[PDB]
Amino acid sequence: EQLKNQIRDARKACADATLSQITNNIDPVGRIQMRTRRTLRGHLAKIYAMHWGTDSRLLVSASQDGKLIIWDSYTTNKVHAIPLRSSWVMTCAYAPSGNYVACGGLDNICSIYNLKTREGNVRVSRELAGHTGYLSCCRFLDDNQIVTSSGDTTCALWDIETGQQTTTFTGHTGDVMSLSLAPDTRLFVSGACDASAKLWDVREGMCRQTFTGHESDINAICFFPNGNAFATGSDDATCRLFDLRADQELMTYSHDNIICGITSVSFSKSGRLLLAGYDDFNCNVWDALKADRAGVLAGHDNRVSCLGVTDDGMAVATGSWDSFLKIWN
Amino acid sequence: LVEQLKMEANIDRIKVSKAAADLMAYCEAHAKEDPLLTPVPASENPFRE
Amino acid sequence: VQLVESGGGLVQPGGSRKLSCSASGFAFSSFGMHWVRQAPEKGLEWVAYISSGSGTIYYADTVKGRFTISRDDPKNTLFLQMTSLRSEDTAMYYCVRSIYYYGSSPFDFWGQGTTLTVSDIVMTQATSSVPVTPGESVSISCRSSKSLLHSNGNTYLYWFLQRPGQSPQLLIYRMSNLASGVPDRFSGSGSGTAFTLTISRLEAEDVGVYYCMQHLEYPLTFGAGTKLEL
Amino acid sequence: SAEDKAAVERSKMIEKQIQKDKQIYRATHRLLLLGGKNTIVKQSGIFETKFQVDKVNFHMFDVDERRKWIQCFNDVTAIIFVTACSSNRLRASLKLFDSIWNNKWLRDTSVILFLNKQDLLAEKIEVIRAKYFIRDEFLRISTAHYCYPHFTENIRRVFNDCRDIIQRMHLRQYELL
Amino acid sequence: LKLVLKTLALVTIISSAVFGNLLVVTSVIRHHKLRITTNYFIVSLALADTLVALFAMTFNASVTISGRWLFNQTVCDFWNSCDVLFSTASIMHLCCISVDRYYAIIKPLEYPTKITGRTVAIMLTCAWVSSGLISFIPIFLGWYTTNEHLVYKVEHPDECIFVVNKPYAIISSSVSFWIPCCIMLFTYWRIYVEATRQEKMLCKAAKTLGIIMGAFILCWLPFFLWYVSITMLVVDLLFWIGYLNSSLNPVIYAYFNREFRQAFKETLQAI
Ligand SMILES: NC[C@H](O)c1ccc(O)cc1
């Protein structure tokens, strides 16, 4: 128990001053309207997640319906509809190459779909397993490698063709509910019940950094586009942000008005705008520097399930729980 | 669990001021190009309506 | 995947005949289809097209009143009916699949073909035969009467190089991209009014006749041709 | 815009298929299982099943560490909580009941309670009065939407209870109770 | 004096009707979360009552304010046809809504597989077609009135009053009130008894049922009582309580719906 004591003493001794003092002298953003510019309907149940492609035009969304569908966002057309075998999928993905889709959830098995088949009908390219808990996120690392985070307190890296997990990650104690990977695809962070966001190196294979600034559980996380920080949302209505080199928490976007938890968070291309989604029928938008609300995004009537920015930052899509996708701008 | 403590001790933590300065510098440098910070003209917006 | 065409023969003018296409190897219900006939000494010519659910059906403006076309998904067969034919319709036919969505590659596969015996947008393939030497870039040019650039920013032009003895193949779609089973040597380029296809390394399989094709307009006229010699 | 027109037509076809699947889906009246039960359903790995009775479809969701995926089961017609009270573990079942009640997102989703495996209780064993007393203890704990207790054919019970739940919900919608 | 008071009250009724119906239509169109097949009856009922307010009450208010009928006789026949058509459409529309609720309460488990979009469209088409058939054909053809009243009109063409003959009276009364009235008194009574049984087994339906049924019956009964009983200034009243019912319909049949209550609040905030 002495080792952790001296570790925490050294960590607290390496902090001199906060960035709040150095930020109050900077120009703020004022207000952003961010009115709906497009809507997507055709689902029959609550959308659970969605993820833009690397081209920032196509998107894929899955719901409790039992089918995940791929929209061409510019013209609202349904490019594809995939009739999922199991009705319980709690995540999505869209490979950077743009050829494969991913799904998983209570089925305990991850499914990889191949869009660019010889025929015009998609199929399960690879139904790969090896997890004893429900899957939270299945982000695509590359064409043939996928990183998954299951509820068994461990997260895995899977080789698509072979099937077996190349690398395991067993550093946690609770179930990881949210996994995100850096744009450089070299590191990735996750959070679980134990309220400890862990940063992992893909090649190292075991935990590189840990953060314990929260209380209840890290129920949503996302990465900074620069690649040296990440912001998370918990059940404490807290949007605590952490850096990487300093290993210490920077500042908190906490408002006592919200008592419920968070659903998802996301940044902008510049990074000086941290969108977020709450259970109180609204999407508050923060500012990652002044920590002051700069507007609201209220156009839904149920829980805002997953909100995500595009690669080029032209839009944000907020798949909600009322069978609707909304593409703002 | 001893290895976790050893690696945390040897983690070589850095001061927070440099990280905050890097964050704000990157935010200021790449702010002009991205949308969602200033309303965009309809010419460059793909979905005008 | 496989397309098999049946029918044809020799019939005196002013008659009728049914041609059939059996598709085996893919879910062709969600596949638009086209018929393209070629005269023994002329280039390919459009005939008719059917959508996925046989909802939208177009026809060749030259011959529309004496042609019938239909399809049966459970019977796995799409057929065409010719009546009151003439000496002009002495040509061997092709059965073509195509799928239409963002990122699709229409005219992906061409059927084997069966034989049968008894202004709007036009293109200009002025060149006919340009022999080349190994290890040298080969360029083939085509032109259009109306600019093929749309408001979306994609130019609807296709290339249909055909090997000497088999069905035509799809090489370049949408004026820039590349089909699935094509070597990287073939590359399309242009500006929007005159288009070209360039090949860096040439081999025996590269010998063929290259056809340019338009799609802004559903009549889908397609261009005249150019032989390759080695 | 020819390819655009064809893409629009294909999207319309996909939307027609979606409409047909919606017509199928709205007539399912899905159910959740919580917590023997194998005999009930037959007559880790989720054994989702489709069974039709009296020309009415039903979707059973066969399903111990408590997680958040219970919240996503918001639109279930009823939750059948099975309990083989052969006994400690009963108090764990009561704790699960309390967690379900306090989930704050399972509200307005009725829960049926089943006291099955009466043969096991009889072999373990007025004694009928004693089993009624332990049942009454279970309801007393259950006091801490409305729950439907059941103690002894079970498919008929769930049929009647689902009918009552949907009737009460539709009466609530039109302000008749 | 009294004339301005009557005019302002009448235009108030007309304005309330159009405002409520157009607000309902705009709310359901813009929200898109209430496009379920159940709400189509309410939406098209608002449309039919909007047609009522736009066509019939305008002519009736003008003829009450002025007295002289400042239109052609063909316009009078068209006005009477519009009256009958759209009033019968509204009443049969209430009948369709009542049948919908009856199937949604009495047999709820098999309700979603017995009322689909096809069934909703079929019932809406049946109501509209029946109303058009009873209204338009006889008035323009000439069977809507007897030869005695034909001579009555021929004598002085200055003013026109809507009266009918024996077969038109019985047919219009049957296809306009009596069958939908029986549908009310059966289906709503059954749903009320079911609600009462559920409430007593639980250990507010009376007020809702009483208001919903009694409003319609009280505003429509005296007109048809006058009509049928005396086929063999009061008429203006009876007409105007009928149009008063028209005004109340899309407030009563939307305020009691929780989803439509939320939609009404959203639309009011949008103003
Ligand atoms: N709205 C009163 C009108 O005069 C009228 C009369 C008779 C009907 O059957 C329907 C409507």
Rounded to whole angstroms, how far apart are CA atoms C112 and C8?
Answer: 14
In 3D, which of A151, A256, A226, A229 has the Cα closest to residue A194? A151
Backbone angles phi, psi at A153, to 5 degrees: 65, 10
The 10 Å Cβ neighbour count of residue A185 is: 15
Two tokens, residue A248: 């210490």
Contacts of E117 in chain D (CB under 8 A): 23
Q: Strand, helix or coil at C225?
A: coil
- The residue written with tokens 């397309």 in the block is C3
* Domains of chain A, earliest start first: 39-170+302-329 (2.130.10.10), 182-298 (2.130.10.10)
Backbone angles phi, psi at B34, to 5 degrees: -75, 140
In 3D, which of E92, E113, E88 has the Cα closest to residue E103? E113
Rounded to whole angstroms, how far apart are CA atoms C102 and A57?
Answer: 10
Backbone angles phi, psi at C196, to 5 degrees: -150, 155
* Secondary structure of chain A in HEC code, one letter for each residue: CHHHHHHHHHHHHCCCCCCHHHHCCCCCCCCCCCCCCEEECCCCCCEEEEEECCCCCEEEEEECCCCEEEEECCCCEEEEEECCCCCCCCCCEECCCCCEEEECCCCCCEEEEECCCCCCCCEEEEEECCCCCCEEECCECCCCEEEEEECCCCEEEEECCCCCEEEEECCCCCCCCEEEECCCCCEEEEECCCCCEEEEECCCCCEEEEECCCCCCEEEEEECCCCCEEEEEECCCCCCEEECCCCCEEECCCCCCCCCCEEEEECCCCCCCCEEEECCCEEEECCCCCCCCCCEECCCCCCCCEEEECCCCCCEEEECCCCCEEEEC
Contacts of C3 (CB under 8 A, 6+ apart): C21, C22, C23, C95, C97, C109, C110, C111, C112
Angstrom CA distances, C222 to A37, C158, C187, C210, stand at: 39, 9, 19, 11
- Find residue A306's DSSP bridge partners: A319
Q: Is E109 on the interface with D (CB under 8 A)?
A: yes
Neighbours of chain A (3+ CB pairs under 8 A): B, C, D, E
Rounded to whole angstroms, how far apart are CA atoms A81 and A84?
Answer: 9
Q: Strand, helix or coil at B15?
A: coil
Q: Strand, helix or coil at C52?
A: coil
Half-sphere exposure of A188 (CA within 13 A, CB side): 26
In 3D, which of C21, C43, C18 has the Cα closest to residue C33? C21
- Find residue C32's DSSP bridge partners: C98
Assigned CATH for D33-171: 3.40.50.300
In 3D, which of C220, C125, C114, C105 has the Cα closest to residue C167? C114
Angstrom CA distances, D105 to A298, D71, D80, D99, stand at: 21, 6, 17, 11
- The residue written with tokens 């704050």 in the block is D104
Rounded to whole angstroms, how far apart are CA atoms A66 and A59?
Answer: 17
The 10 Å Cβ neighbour count of residue B27 is: 21
The 10 Å Cβ neighbour count of residue C212 is: 28
Q: Which of residues 294-323 of A touch E (CB under 8 A)?
A: 301, 322
Residue D94 near residue D144, CB atoms below 8 Å: no
Q: Residue count of chain B, please give it.
A: 49
Rounded to whole angstroms, how far apart are CA atoms C41 and C111?
Answer: 20
Contact call for C52 and D5, based on CB within 8 A: no
Measured from the CB, is residue E131 less than 6 Å from ligand 1? Answer: no
Q: Which amino acid is at C62?
A: T
Instruction: Tell me E174's DSSP state.
Output: I
- The residue written with tokens 């699949």 in the block is C97
CATH class of C2-98: mainly beta
Rounded to whole angstroms, how far apart are CA atoms E116 and E114?
Answer: 6
Ligand 1 centroid – CA E52 distance (Å): 11
Instruction: Tell me B41's DSSP state.
Output: P
Rounded to whole angstroms, how far apart are CA atoms C81 and C83?
Answer: 7
The 10 Å Cβ neighbour count of residue C26 is: 20
Contacts of C27 in chain A (CB under 8 A): 119-121
Residue D109 near residue D122, CB atoms below 8 Å: no
Contacts of D108 in chain E (CB under 8 A): none
Q: Compute the CA torsion angle A178, A181, A182, A185 (nearest 10 deg).
A: 180
Contacts of D6 in chain A (CB under 8 A): none
In 3D, which of A173, A170, A171, A215 has the Cα closest to residue A192? A173
Two tokens, residue A46: 């609550």
Rounded to whole angstroms, how far apart are CA atoms D39 and D57?
Answer: 19
Contacts of A41 in chain E (CB under 8 A): 32
Contacts of C56 (CB under 8 A, 6+ apart): D5, D6, D9
Instruction: Tell me C230's DSSP state.
Output: -
Measured from the CB, is residue E176 less than 6 Å from ligand 1? Answer: yes
Rounded to whole angstroms, how far apart are CA atoms A76 and A57?
Answer: 10
Could you tell me which chain A residue has the CA closest to the CA of E263?
Answer: A301
Backbone angles phi, psi at E111, to 5 degrees: -60, -50
Residue C174 near residue C156, CB atoms below 8 Å: yes
Two tokens, residue C189: 């380029």
Instruction: Tell me E53's DSSP state.
Output: I
Contact call for D7 and C52, based on CB within 8 A: no
Ligand 1 atom 5, closest CA: E84
Angstrom CA distances, D111 to A12, C158, D31, E31, stand at: 50, 61, 10, 32
Q: Ligand 1 pocket check: which of E55, E87, E134, E238 to mutate, most ligand atoms within 8 Å of Cβ?
A: E87
Residue A313 near residue B35, CB atoms below 8 Å: yes
Contact call for A41 and E33, based on CB within 8 A: no
Contacts of A120 (CB under 8 A, 6+ apart): C26, C27, C30, C31, C99
Rounded to whole angstroms, how far apart are CA atoms E216 and A282?
Answer: 41
What is the H or E stretch that residue C17 is in? Answer: strand C16-24
**Going along chain E, which residue ranges are E strands?**
none
Rounded to whole angstroms, how far apart are CA atoms C27 and A123?
Answer: 12
Rounded to whole angstroms, how far apart are CA atoms E99 and C116?
Answer: 63
Contact call for A301 and E32, based on CB within 8 A: no
Rounded to whole angstroms, how far apart are CA atoms E271 and E264?
Answer: 11
The 10 Å Cβ neighbour count of residue C64 is: 10
Half-sphere exposure of C72 (CA within 13 A, CB side): 9
Half-sphere exposure of E146 (CA within 13 A, CB side): 10
Measured from the CB, is residue E87 less than 6 Å from ligand 1? Answer: yes
Q: Which of residues 178-217 of C touch D (CB under 8 A)?
A: 215-217
In 3D, which of A177, A168, A78 has the Cα closest to residue A131? A168
Helix E40-51, helix E117-141: angle, nearest 10: 20
End-to-end CA distance of chain E: 34
Ligand 1 atom 7, closest CA: E84
Measured from the CB, is residue E135 less than 6 Å from ligand 1? Answer: no
Instruction: Tell me D174's DSSP state.
Output: T
In 3D, which of C29, C65, D8, E233 has the Cα closest to residue A78? D8
Residue E249 near residue E90, CB atoms below 8 Å: yes
In this complex, the residue of D159, D170, D176 whose CB is nearest that of residue E208 is D176
Q: Is E262 on the interface with D (CB under 8 A)?
A: no
Q: Is A80 on the interface with C (CB under 8 A)?
A: yes
Instruction: For domain C138-214, give its CATH number from 1.20.950.20, 2.60.40.10, 3.40.50.970, 3.30.1330.60.
Output: 2.60.40.10
Q: Strand, helix or coil at C62?
A: coil
Could you tell me which chain A residue has the CA closest to the CA of D76?
Answer: A64
Looking at CA atoms only, how far is residue C48 from chain D in angstroms? Answer: 15
In this complex, the residue of D1, D4, D6 whose CB is nearest that of residue C32 is D6
In 3D, which of D69, D90, D73 has the Cα closest to residue D31? D73
Distance of CA E74 to the CA centre of its chain: 24
Backbone angles phi, psi at C29, to 5 degrees: -60, -45
Contacts of E33 (CB under 8 A, 6+ apart): A301, A322, E259
- The residue written with tokens 């007559």 in the block is D43
In 3D, which of E153, E39, E140 has the Cα closest to residue E85? E140
Half-sphere exposure of E226 (CA within 13 A, CB side): 14
Burial E30-66 (b: 16+ CB within 10 A, else e): ebebbeebbbbbbbbbbbbbbbbbbbbbebbbbbbee
Contacts of E211 (CB under 8 A, 6+ apart): E252
Q: Which of residues 10-49 of B touch A (CB under 8 A)?
A: 11, 13-24, 26-28, 30-31, 33-37, 39-40, 45-47, 49
Rounded to whole angstroms, how far apart are CA atoms C47 and C222?
Answer: 12
Position in ligand 1 atom list of the atom nearest CA E173? 9
Position in ligand 1 atom list of the atom nearest CA E172? 9
Which CATH superfamily, name and number, covers E2-270?
Rhodopsin 7-helix transmembrane proteins (1.20.1070.10)
Q: Compute the CA torsion angle A18, A22, A26, A32 (nearest 10 deg).
A: 0
Q: Is A77 on the interface with C (CB under 8 A)?
A: yes
Looking at CA atoms only, how far is residue A47 from chain E in angstroms? Answer: 15
Distance of CA C133 to the CA centre of its chain: 28
What is the H or E stretch that residue C38 is in? Answer: strand C32-38
Rounded to whole angstroms, how far apart are CA atoms D45 and A300?
Answer: 34
Residue A307 near residue A316, CB atoms below 8 Å: yes
Ligand 1 atom 6, closest CA: E84
Ligand 1 centroid – CA E74 distance (Å): 18
Measured from the CB, is residue E88 less than 6 Å from ligand 1? Answer: yes
Cross-sheet strand order for the sheet of C16-24: C2-6, C16-24, C77-83, C67-72
Rounded to whole angstroms, how far apart are CA atoms E238 and E227?
Answer: 10
Rounded to whole angstroms, how far apart are CA atoms D165 and D146?
Answer: 9
In 3D, which of D111, D45, D38, D42 has the Cα closest to residue D73? D111
Q: Is D175 on the interface with A (CB under 8 A)?
A: no
Q: Strand, helix or coil at E196?
A: helix
Tell me the DSSP string of C89-123.
---EEEEEEE--STT--SS--B---B--B-----B
Instruction: Tell me C152's DSSP state.
Output: T
What is the H or E stretch that residue E146 is in? Answer: none
In 3D, which of E33, E98, E217 has the Cα closest to residue D174? E98
Breaks following residues of chain E (C-to-N distance > 2.5 Å)? 203, 232
* Helices and strands of chain C, counted as H and E runs: 0, 14
Contact call for A81 and D22, based on CB within 8 A: no
Method used for this model? cryo-EM
